[PDB]
Design a protein around this nucleic acid. Structure first.
Ligand SMILES: [Mg+2]
Ligand SMILES: [Mg+2]
Ligand SMILES: [Mg+2]
Length: 154
RNA sequence: GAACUGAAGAGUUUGAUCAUGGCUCAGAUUGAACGCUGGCGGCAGGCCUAACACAUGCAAGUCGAGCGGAUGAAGGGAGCU
């Protein structure tokens, strides 16, 4: 998949004798818009190098997400650290009602109707972890049918 | 056949980081007031304060087919003119 979103770019510093060394960190998300999505972090002493490292890292470790035709299966509630995330499917006319990192993640993954919200700390990287944790543990029918036959469970 | 369908975050504590936590901002509303500016129309609204004191007009009268009385037309005439 090839859809690049630059979620965040930040400048960090470390102290040595002489003064400070500055570094640049980038967090990006990659996906095809039809089920696969991954995220990557990259640090360098230059912004382009950090962004390229983040893109290369995100292009690895992609995951497959089960979705109901550009729409979620059921409401989801997922947490990582101090960040908490609520999601729930919406109708066709809706867009993406989400803020910041969540919007990039959901748009990249390929869902178009998400009506989402976040509570707790709104650190973008932790929000991205929480959003992938919610999206990855999404079952969808014919997999919850491990118990018994299908069309009777629903 | 309908009577609903719906939820965004950002800045700021550090050399840098995560968390906690307060402050501030982006929206929608007023019986509003003030500053600058000002063409027209339709529909509404207009003492939120002193239940403070009030000049002057008007805002509750009608019935003569309930009853006496006094006001007494036009006319028919009568006299004198
Ligand atoms: Mg907080
Ligand atoms: Mg500083
Ligand atoms: Mg009054």
């Amino acid at each position: 998949g090839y859809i690049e979103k630059l979620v965040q770019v930040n400048r960090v510093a470390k102290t040595v004798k002489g003064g400070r060394i500055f570094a640049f960190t980038a967090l990006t998300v990659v996906g095809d818009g039809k089920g696969r999505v991954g995220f990557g972090r990259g640090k360098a002493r230059e912004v382009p190098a950090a962004i390229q490292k983040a893109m290369e890292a995100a292009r690895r470790n992609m995951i497959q997400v089960d979705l109901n035709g550009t729409t979620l299966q059921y409401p989801t509630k997922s947490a990582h650290g101090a960040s908490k995330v609520y999601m729930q499917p919406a109708s066709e006319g809706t867009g993406i009602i989400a803020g910041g990192a969540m919007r990039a993640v959901l748009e990249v993954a390929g869902v178009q109707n998400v009506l989402a919200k976040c509570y707790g700390s709104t650190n973008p990287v932790n929000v991205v972890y929480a959003t992938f944790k919610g999206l990855k543990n999404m079952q969808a029918p014919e997999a919850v049918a491990a118990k018994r036959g299908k069309s009777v469970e629903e």
